[PDB]
Ligand binder design. Sequence first.
Ligand SMILES: *[C@@H]1O[C@H](CO[C@@H]2O[C@@H](C)[C@@H](O)[C@@H](O)[C@@H]2O)[C@@H](O[C@@H]2O[C@H](CO)[C@@H](O[C@@H]3O[C@H](CO[C@H]4O[C@H](CO)[C@@H](O)[C@H](O)[C@@H]4O[C@@H]4O[C@H](CO)[C@@H](O[C@@H]5O[C@H](CO)[C@H](O)[C@H](O)[C@H]5O)[C@H](O)[C@H]4NC(C)=O)[C@@H](O)[C@H](O[C@H]4O[C@H](CO)[C@@H](O)[C@H](O)[C@@H]4O[C@@H]4O[C@H](CO)[C@@H](O)[C@H](O)[C@H]4NC(C)=O)[C@@H]3O)[C@H](O)[C@H]2NC(C)=O)[C@H](O)[C@H]1NC(C)=O
Ligand SMILES: *[C@@H]1O[C@H](CO)[C@@H](O[C@@H]2O[C@H](CO)[C@@H](O[C@@H]3O[C@H](CO[C@H]4O[C@H](CO)[C@@H](O)[C@H](O)[C@@H]4O[C@@H]4O[C@H](CO)[C@@H](O[C@@H]5O[C@H](CO)[C@H](O)[C@H](O)[C@H]5O)[C@H](O)[C@H]4NC(C)=O)[C@@H](O)[C@H](O[C@H]4O[C@H](CO)[C@@H](O)[C@H](O)[C@@H]4O)[C@@H]3O)[C@H](O)[C@H]2NC(C)=O)[C@H](O)[C@H]1NC(C)=O
Lengths: 207, 192
Amino acid sequence: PSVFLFPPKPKDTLMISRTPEVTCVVVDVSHEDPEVKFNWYVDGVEVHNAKTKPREEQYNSTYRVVSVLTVLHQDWLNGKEYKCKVSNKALPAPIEKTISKAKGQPREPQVYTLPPCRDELTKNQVSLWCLVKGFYPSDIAVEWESNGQPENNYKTTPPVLDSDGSFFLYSALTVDKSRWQQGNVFSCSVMHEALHNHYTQKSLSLS
Amino acid sequence: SVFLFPPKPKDTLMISRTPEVTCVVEVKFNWYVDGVEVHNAKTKPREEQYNSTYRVVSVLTVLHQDWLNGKEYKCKVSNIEKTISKAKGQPREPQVCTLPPSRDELTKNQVSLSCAVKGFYPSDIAVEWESNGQPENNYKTTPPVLDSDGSFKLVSKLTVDKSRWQQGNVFSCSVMHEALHNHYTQKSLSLS
Ligand SMILES: *[C@@H]1O[C@H](CO[C@@H]2O[C@@H](C)[C@@H](O)[C@@H](O)[C@@H]2O)[C@@H](O[C@@H]2O[C@H](CO)[C@@H](O[C@@H]3O[C@H](CO[C@H]4O[C@H](CO)[C@@H](O)[C@H](O)[C@@H]4O[C@@H]4O[C@H](CO)[C@@H](O[C@@H]5O[C@H](CO)[C@H](O)[C@H](O)[C@H]5O)[C@H](O)[C@H]4NC(C)=O)[C@@H](O)[C@H](O[C@H]4O[C@H](CO)[C@@H](O)[C@H](O)[C@@H]4O[C@@H]4O[C@H](CO)[C@@H](O)[C@H](O)[C@H]4NC(C)=O)[C@@H]3O)[C@H](O)[C@H]2NC(C)=O)[C@H](O)[C@H]1NC(C)=O
Ligand SMILES: *[C@@H]1O[C@H](CO)[C@@H](O[C@@H]2O[C@H](CO)[C@@H](O[C@@H]3O[C@H](CO[C@H]4O[C@H](CO)[C@@H](O)[C@H](O)[C@@H]4O[C@@H]4O[C@H](CO)[C@@H](O[C@@H]5O[C@H](CO)[C@H](O)[C@H](O)[C@H]5O)[C@H](O)[C@H]4NC(C)=O)[C@@H](O)[C@H](O[C@H]4O[C@H](CO)[C@@H](O)[C@H](O)[C@@H]4O)[C@@H]3O)[C@H](O)[C@H]2NC(C)=O)[C@H](O)[C@H]1NC(C)=O
């Protein structure tokens, strides 16, 4: 019997409209000891509002049991610790698992847009670049758009630890050449806790 | 628990360096190559750990063309078997694109020279920076990320003083990869 504790998504913690949840997942729950019990704590204080989905037996004849705790957005952003305690008569001692936001002072992202270079314009497609650096923690969200509408053909690298302890990434949005020299303006939305309104936006166009 | 690790990319692309597959775990290893067994391995002893258990590693040297032709390397651990190989598929040439800093980036005193390397396959690749033929220290590369078409891309970011960029030093992004001619290519960049 194994337990896995998953954090909220970054977008969910950064917008009061959305619902951030911590998710405790238990797998390899045998048939001879099926019942599972979750105890939740935030900063060592037990909470009772979690919601434990009914068990679902997998195609390997073991059960998957999930427990979802909704967190207050500013609790997570203030680094409370969420502890999932899982109890099962199969186990000798119950399994504890703790998750939190990374410790460390938040640092504002620097969002630099970058046009293609001289030598990619031979091809039909064109990559426009969005450099985001110097942020902490690595929880962040990056989206692209133009004309007030989302772009789908973008890929974003994982956050990468920099020399100075912050993080950086790049987002590359690839569009048609004819879209870019028409002179459509493309924009790089970035969501991170250390930005004002948790949001910023940098636009890009030929000139 | 056995874990079998590939060679480092630049080890396989330079004839002068020695590429090694590493098998991390009394223990005995045998090794094969295409099922064909091989006795050139060197188990290196030994490492007791921080939780009162073993950490026995064997290391097998590999011929560069062998691994680059994609041959499989078996690590038998006697007390389990694991295998690895080069990524199968057609090596696609990296496209190497140097990008200078942004307009708003020059408010601050350091500057980010970017180097987009996209379109390469397999993901095994090495990226370095230099100026006046001397190594850079302050750069970081992102892991290769899979794209729509099945190639990979990454970016490598070197930071230096606005002093040196505004002064006009030429910086170059070196890329090593099997699909490139002589396993190497180099794109330079400077202001003007
Ligand atoms: C029997 O079957 C079960 C079930 O499998 C199913 O049935 C079988 C029959 C097959 O058909 C199979 O294909 C089916 O899927 C088996 O159960 C599996 O057990 C393995 C372990 O053996 C589990 O593996 C872990 O996976 C983690 C990632 O899990 C996610 O990703 C996969 C896809 O890759 C999904 O399938 C999972 O469901 C998980 O998906 C995530 O789930 C979250 C919970 O809902 C989502 O978050 C919520 O999302 C909602 C909205 O959706 C909201 O946003 C909420 O706010 C949010 O909470 C999340 O979005 C979703 N993500 C994705 C991408 O989909 C790994 O993380 C984990 O790795 C850790 O532990 C390993 C040790 O086991 C270790 O090697 C790793 O290195 C890593 O260790 C961690 O490392 C990190 C750093 O990277 C550190 O930070 C940590 O500290 C460190 N922790 C630890 C403890 O070490 C595991 O590899 C697998 O999840 C599980 N499957 C399922 C479906 O649950 C069972 O094994 C079978 N039995 C046998 C005997 O085979
Ligand atoms: C007691 O405590 C010990 C020590 O803490 C524990 O041992 C641990 O066991 C874990 C398994 O339970 C294991 O986790 C797996 O890790 C592997 C790979 O891990 C890499 O990352 C670590 C850093 O994050 C390193 O510490 C590891 O050593 C390993 O790093 C790689 O190591 C190679 C050898 O050092 C090296 O390759 C060679 O390098 C040389 C010189 O550097 C040459 O160039 C040569 O050419 C190379 O070949 C790599 O460069 C190096 N890389 C880096 C970045 O450091 C991981 O693959 C595995 O993932 C599993 O799960 C995924 C899905 O989750 C699945 O797809 C995989 O198939 C796989 O099954 C696990 O996460 C720990 O690594 C290990 N710790 C150490 C230090 O070895 C145990 O808990 C206890 N002991 C016992 C016996 O129980």
